[PDB]
Design an enzyme around this catalytic site. Structure first.
Site, PDB file in Angstrom:
ATOM      1  N   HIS A 111      54.640  90.613  53.900  1.00  0.00           N
ATOM      2  CA  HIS A 111      54.573  92.075  53.795  1.00  0.00           C
ATOM      3  C   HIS A 111      54.113  92.685  55.120  1.00  0.00           C
ATOM      4  O   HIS A 111      53.153  92.190  55.727  1.00  0.00           O
ATOM      5  CB  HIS A 111      53.634  92.492  52.659  1.00  0.00           C
ATOM      6  CG  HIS A 111      53.697  93.949  52.319  1.00  0.00           C
TER       7      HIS A 111
ATOM      8  N   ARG B  79      61.556  80.787  63.075  1.00  0.00           N
ATOM      9  CA  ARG B  79      62.074  81.820  63.958  1.00  0.00           C
ATOM     10  C   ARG B  79      61.261  81.865  65.242  1.00  0.00           C
ATOM     11  O   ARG B  79      60.033  81.791  65.200  1.00  0.00           O
ATOM     12  CB  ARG B  79      62.071  83.199  63.284  1.00  0.00           C
ATOM     13  CG  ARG B  79      62.848  84.220  64.086  1.00  0.00           C
ATOM     14  CD  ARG B  79      63.061  85.537  63.384  1.00  0.00           C
ATOM     15  NE  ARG B  79      61.851  86.349  63.361  1.00  0.00           N
ATOM     16  CZ  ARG B  79      61.846  87.676  63.371  1.00  0.00           C
ATOM     17  NH1 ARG B  79      62.991  88.342  63.423  1.00  0.00           N
ATOM     18  NH2 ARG B  79      60.696  88.337  63.348  1.00  0.00           N
TER      19      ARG B  79
ATOM     20  N   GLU C 181      69.965  91.691  68.151  1.00  0.00           N
ATOM     21  CA  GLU C 181      69.143  92.854  67.835  1.00  0.00           C
ATOM     22  C   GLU C 181      69.669  94.126  68.494  1.00  0.00           C
ATOM     23  O   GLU C 181      70.080  95.063  67.804  1.00  0.00           O
ATOM     24  CB  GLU C 181      67.685  92.594  68.241  1.00  0.00           C
ATOM     25  CG  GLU C 181      66.992  91.484  67.442  1.00  0.00           C
ATOM     26  CD  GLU C 181      65.476  91.499  67.592  1.00  0.00           C
ATOM     27  OE1 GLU C 181      64.886  92.598  67.643  1.00  0.00           O
ATOM     28  OE2 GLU C 181      64.866  90.411  67.650  1.00  0.00           O
TER      29      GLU C 181
ATOM     30  N   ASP D 236      65.619  96.476  63.757  1.00  0.00           N
ATOM     31  CA  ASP D 236      65.563  96.167  65.188  1.00  0.00           C
ATOM     32  C   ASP D 236      66.592  96.991  65.976  1.00  0.00           C
ATOM     33  O   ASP D 236      66.252  97.691  66.948  1.00  0.00           O
ATOM     34  CB  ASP D 236      65.777  94.662  65.387  1.00  0.00           C
ATOM     35  CG  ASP D 236      64.792  93.791  64.574  1.00  0.00           C
ATOM     36  OD1 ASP D 236      63.632  93.585  65.011  1.00  0.00           O
ATOM     37  OD2 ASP D 236      65.177  93.326  63.477  1.00  0.00           O
TER      38      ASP D 236
ATOM     39  N   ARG E 129      65.587  92.969  57.626  1.00  0.00           N
ATOM     40  CA  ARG E 129      64.943  94.091  56.962  1.00  0.00           C
ATOM     41  C   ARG E 129      65.531  95.422  57.433  1.00  0.00           C
ATOM     42  O   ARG E 129      66.182  95.520  58.471  1.00  0.00           O
ATOM     43  CB  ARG E 129      63.433  94.066  57.201  1.00  0.00           C
ATOM     44  CG  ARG E 129      63.010  94.560  58.568  1.00  0.00           C
ATOM     45  CD  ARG E 129      61.504  94.692  58.650  1.00  0.00           C
ATOM     46  NE  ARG E 129      61.017  95.785  57.820  1.00  0.00           N
ATOM     47  CZ  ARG E 129      60.863  97.029  58.254  1.00  0.00           C
ATOM     48  NH1 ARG E 129      61.163  97.320  59.512  1.00  0.00           N
ATOM     49  NH2 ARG E 129      60.412  97.977  57.436  1.00  0.00           N
TER      50      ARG E 129
ATOM     51  N   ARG F  47      57.250  96.458  68.703  1.00  0.00           N
ATOM     52  CA  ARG F  47      58.030  95.854  67.638  1.00  0.00           C
ATOM     53  C   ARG F  47      58.492  96.921  66.646  1.00  0.00           C
ATOM     54  O   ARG F  47      57.868  97.976  66.479  1.00  0.00           O
ATOM     55  CB  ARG F  47      57.205  94.808  66.905  1.00  0.00           C
ATOM     56  CG  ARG F  47      56.534  93.842  67.821  1.00  0.00           C
ATOM     57  CD  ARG F  47      57.437  92.678  68.089  1.00  0.00           C
ATOM     58  NE  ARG F  47      58.056  92.228  66.854  1.00  0.00           N
ATOM     59  CZ  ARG F  47      58.342  90.961  66.596  1.00  0.00           C
ATOM     60  NH1 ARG F  47      58.032  90.029  67.480  1.00  0.00           N
ATOM     61  NH2 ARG F  47      58.905  90.625  65.445  1.00  0.00           N
TER      62      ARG F  47
END
Ligand SMILES: [Cl-]
Lengths: 948, 139
Positions: free
Chosen positions: A168, A443, A553, A590, A628, A760
């Protein structure tokens, strides 16, 4: 205590009408709220309660008419609170919002589906109230498309839906609090059984209050910013909550629906229609807390949890399996197993007689499951064991073989019905969850691999792999992967980082392959990144290497992606290593951070188109992994149309999707919610393979290309070109506070000294979610639609045609509209007034104007006058949450001014009855202002859930 | 033990120190932890076999056919290099597996246990250098 009469009034003013006839949501929320407020009064006094209730009513009046006077009143009350009262108020509103989400889950879970509300087209697939269930989807495929049932069944057997659980972005709520939420939901539900006895109803009410108080009296801070193993233990809660029981239930329902169109078989028990993957403990991208040992730990923990569950389940299976008549093969196995030493069922039988051969084989399997848990626990807790690997299950075939023997044997004797009971459920659980429940993906950044290769090439005096052109990199990587000489040894200067990368590969090599999914390269740009990972995998003696998945990305990475993938397929070594299967990952959030949301959505559609072109050219089975932020990452109904909306043949029977941490509770917390989740994923996948969305008219493509250009120009001109934007972002937004506090395990920036580029995407989204402004989601749409509308009067009509007939566009707009519903520029303005320098106020003002303009334009595009005109159920639930969230916003803003500015003295009010101020002793900030801030962040985060 | 000896001598108890204690120290020093130190011995041809299987596995030619000067030159470039030489992916005859496994056993045991590696039928520097290289590349 006529206080109740007030909250009812306010609630009904918030949700005026009924979204159906079983619309008991306002009732639910009133009941929960009343019980909670009584508990608040009994624990902290009548004054505290009266204060909290006045705050809630003011907030509800605001979410009603949006009068800024109401915000001034909320603020006036909240600044005059000393830190103790501030903690109790923030905690109070967090818990009240939680209760709202609980009543929401109950309402959704028991809403009767209205068969007369279906319009007949794809729009129905955007809400649970009108979406197609499994059988309705079968009938749609057979009638409209004239597909034969045999084709549907064959499509289903070879289909896989792969749900990937990630940590989360904030408070992955503790497993204990999930348990409490469950008990509350159940109490609520049972209270409304239209047949319940007075004493039953009384005891249920007392149990509900009891559990509301229990949840309120648990701290939600202190201890540690939980270790990655703790976060993983918490993520695995939903397997015990619902998923373990839920998989065999869903699959059996599939069986029934197949029966209801003439299919006599069942879905094969070993067919992987459902799979679960995990990032918890495997994603190390910008997260140094995730170490090699972390990966070893969560792998072993997973093997433990799975063996435990199989152990408990196989005892009920042993009691069921009391037959005696059997296959000759199984009889042989029974006599063979009867030649041995019976410890784990002395409570049940002294020993198992050979007249119960099934029980013999199963008892042995139970023994092997116990030894697997014990050995995994010893490996985790020490590093060695003493449990022989020959006495445990090391691969999934060892486990399946005796069970399949029982199934075959039972069917031989006409006991197929018995075989299709607990035994079939068991086989399906073994096949779906394997020996680990989840498969961990790893990752890492591409730059870390480049660092490692550069240290090697430097150590061999061949030059700097970093300085090499991409073609030279490729050439060297190719010569090495095809070579017979190892690459490096212990005699190698390893930085702490390079040691981390290599040690991670060594851990991967020393663990069973059943434990791992995919190695994912963040910031992939060129074939040399993938080849680099493949080579490191081989030279670290990873026997069964992972599949390598590039995560493209940035926007340029997406345009260059299919060229790169083609070059990778065109390499002989890689082509033979992949064995005709390639998985590529896309990150909606991203790419959004890079170039705005509209441009990233359209570019991702086009990039998937081109990637399928390459995969067909070279004959590889492409699998798109959805990160996501996507349309498919939403909660509930919308997921159905989102999946259906993907470009033709991008799925092809293999859907891999991220289950976002802010959504996993709404999708798996409750039995019905889980079932319907698995259903809409399976149905959406099955349908899309056979019935792709329409191909876009060429003018639609040209229009979206132009809009993407303008939108990227605006987004970048604001976020990256405006010099003072970064100044504003640090003031109007708690991004810095988020980076400093114990909310997420990850650093918010890759390089502390960078601008937005080094930030990020998650803290980027989060920072603007907290102020109810949501800039990362809608910025760029305004100027794009404005542009095309002015360029030709008629382009608006074209946009409206797209929204009504092109699924991809409809779901994109729809998502934007949902995010606007969770937006309130007035609150963003409050943050400006309290936290932003005066000469920067007009900046924010202009931004807010964009916000407003975009909203209107989105509405015009969707053919709506109000936000979410087409989904009044969601409009209702959102409005109900907003009444709690708004108080947490005002509290957050004033708490921020109080933290940053010790020269802002306030006329405090007397403390309000018995404490919570002394649960964070080693705080550098005020006695409970850090805790107050953390509470509002967790709270607003939980109320706003998912945006982009 | 040396602490006991030093201590005893400090107190003028050197005679006591020169009794069973001195005998013990001398036994520790003479016999070490093993009594004996094991020498290893192998034919040079077995090492040549191993190197030839490697050079064949790397498609560089046959270390066996190479002149002594070419053998020396290759052995020198490899011993001074920073890249390991071979891995599990190596076709090992039963004999070559014996030689390599012997080196692996040597690596997994305390140095106090070993004396000298002795090349039967030594004839040229390439035999000694070969053993040195196998020793290094077997860690
Ligand atoms: Cl007994």
């Amino acid at each position: 205590l006529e206080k109740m009469a007030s909250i009812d009034v306010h609630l009904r003013q918030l949700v005026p009408g009924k979204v159906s006839e079983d619309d008991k949501l306002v009732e639910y929320d009133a009941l929960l709220l009343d019980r909670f407020l009584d508990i608040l009064q009994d624990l902290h006094g009548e004054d505290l309660r009266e204060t909290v209730q006045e705050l809630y009513e003011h907030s509800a009046e605001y979410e009603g008419k949006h009068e800024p006077k109401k915000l001034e009143e909320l603020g006036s009350v909240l600044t005059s609170l000393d830190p103790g009262d501030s903690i109790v108020i923030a905690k109070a509103f967090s818990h009240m919002l939680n209760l709202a989400n609980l009543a929401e889950e109950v309402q959704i879970a028991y809403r009767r589906r209205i068969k007369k509300l279906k319009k007949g087209d794809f729009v129905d697939e955007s809400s649970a109230t009108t979406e197609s269930d499994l059988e309705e989807t079968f009938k749609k495929l057979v009638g409209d498309l004239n597909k034969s049932p045999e084709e549907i069944f064959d499509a289903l057997k070879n289909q896989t839906v792969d749900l990937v659980l990630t940590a989360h972005p904030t408070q992955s709520v503790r497993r204990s609090l999930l348990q409490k939420h469950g008990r509350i939901r159940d109490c609520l539900a049972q209270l409304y059984a239209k047949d319940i006895t007075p004493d039953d109803k009384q005891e249920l009410d007392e149990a509900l209050q009891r559990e509301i108080q229990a949840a309120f009296r648990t701290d939600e801070i202190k201890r540690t910013p939980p270790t990655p193993q703790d976060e993983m233990r918490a993520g695995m809660s939903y397997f015990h909550e619902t998923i373990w029981k839920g998989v065999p239930k869903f699959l059996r329902r599939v069986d029934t629906a197949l029966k209801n169109i003439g299919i006599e078989e069942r879905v094969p028990y070993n067919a992987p229609l459902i799979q679960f993957s995990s990032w918890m403990g495997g994603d190390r991208d910008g997260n140094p807390r995730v170490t090699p040992e972390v990966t070893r730990d969560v792998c072993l923990l997973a093997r433990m949890m799975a063996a435990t569950m199989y152990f408990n389940q196989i005892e009920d299976l042993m009691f069921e399996m009391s037959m005696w008549r059997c296959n000759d093969e199984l009889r042989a196995r029974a006599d063979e197993v009867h030649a041995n030493s019976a410890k784990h069922y002395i409570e049940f039988w002294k020993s198992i007689p050979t007249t119960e051969p099934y029980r013999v084989i199963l008892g042995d399997v139970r023994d092997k499951l116990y030894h697997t848990r014990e050995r995994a626990h010893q490996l985790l807790s020490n590093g060695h064991s003493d449990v022989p690997v020959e006495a445990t299950f090391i691969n999934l075939e060892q486990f399946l073989e005796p069970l399949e023997l029982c199934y075959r044997s039972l069917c031989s004797c006409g006991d197929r019905p018995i075989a299709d009971g607990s035994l079939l459920d068991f086989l399906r659980q073994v096949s779906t969850f394997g020996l680990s429940l989840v498969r961990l993906d790893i990752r890492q950044e591409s730059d870390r691999h480049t660092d490692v290769l550069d240290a090697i090439t430097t150590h061999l005096d061949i030059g700097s792999y970093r300085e090499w052109s991409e073609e030279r990199r490729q050439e060297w990587l190719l010569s090495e992967l095809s070579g017979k000489r190892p690459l490096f040894g212990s005699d190698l200067p390893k930085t702490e980082e390079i040691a981390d990368v290599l040690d991670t590969f060594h851990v991967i090599a020393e663990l069973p392959a059943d434990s791992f999914g995919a190695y994912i390269i963040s910031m992939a740009t060129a074939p040399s990144d993938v080849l680099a990972v493949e080579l490191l995998q081989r030279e670290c003696r990873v026997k069964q290497p992972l599949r390598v998945v590039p995560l493209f990305e940035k926007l340029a990475d997406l345009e260059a992606a299919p060229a790169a993938v083609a070059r990778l397929f065109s390499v002989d070594w890689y082509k033979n290593r992949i064995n005709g299967k390639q998985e590529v990952m896309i990150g909606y959030s991203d790419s959004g951070k890079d170039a705005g949301r509209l441009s990233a959505a359209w570019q991702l559609y086009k990039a998937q188109e081109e990637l399928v072109k390459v995969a067909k050219e070279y004959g590889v089975k492409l699998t798109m992994f959805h990160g996501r932020g996507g349309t498919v990452g939403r909660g509930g109904g919308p997921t159905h149309l989102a999946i259906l909306s993907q470009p033709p043949d991008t799925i092809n029977g293999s859907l891999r999707v991220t289950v976002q941490g802010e959504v996993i509770e709404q999708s798996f917390g409750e039995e019905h919610l889980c079932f319907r989740t698995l259903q809409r994923f399976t149905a959406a996948t099955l349908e899309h393979g056979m019935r792709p969305p329409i191909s876009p008219k060429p003018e639609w493509r040209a229009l979206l290309d132009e809009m993407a250009v303008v939108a990227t120009e605006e987004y970048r001109s604001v976020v990256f070109q405006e010099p003072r934007f970064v100044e504003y972002f640090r003031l109007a937004t708690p991004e810095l506070e988020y980076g400093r506090m114990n909310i997420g395990s990850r650093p918010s920036k890759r390089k502390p000294s960078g601008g937005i580029e080094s930030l990020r995407a998650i803290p980027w989204i989060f920072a603007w979610i907290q102020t109810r402004f949501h800039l990362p989601v809608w910025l760029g749409f305004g100027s794009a639609i404005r542009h095309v509308i002015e360029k030709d009067v008629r382009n608006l009509h074209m946009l409206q045609d797209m929204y009504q007939h092109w699924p991809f566009f409809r779901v994109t707009i729809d998502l934007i509209e949902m995010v606007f519903a969770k937006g309130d520029p007035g609150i963003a303005a409050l943050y400006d007034k309290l936290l932003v320098s005066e000469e920067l106020w007009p900046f924010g003002e202009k931004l807010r104007a964009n916000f407003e303009e975009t909203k209107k334009l989105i509405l015009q595009t969707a053919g709506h006058k109000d936000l979410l005109e087409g989904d009044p159920y969601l409009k209702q639930r959102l409005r109900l949450r907003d009444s709690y969230i708004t108080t947490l916003n005002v509290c957050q803003a004033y708490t921020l001014k109080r933290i940053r500015d010790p020269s802002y003295h306030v006329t405090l009010r007397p403390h309000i009855s018995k404490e919570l101020i002394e649960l964070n002793p080693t705080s550098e900030y005020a006695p409970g202002l850090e805790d107050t801030l953390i509470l509002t962040m967790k709270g607003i985060a939980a109320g706003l859930q998912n945006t982009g």
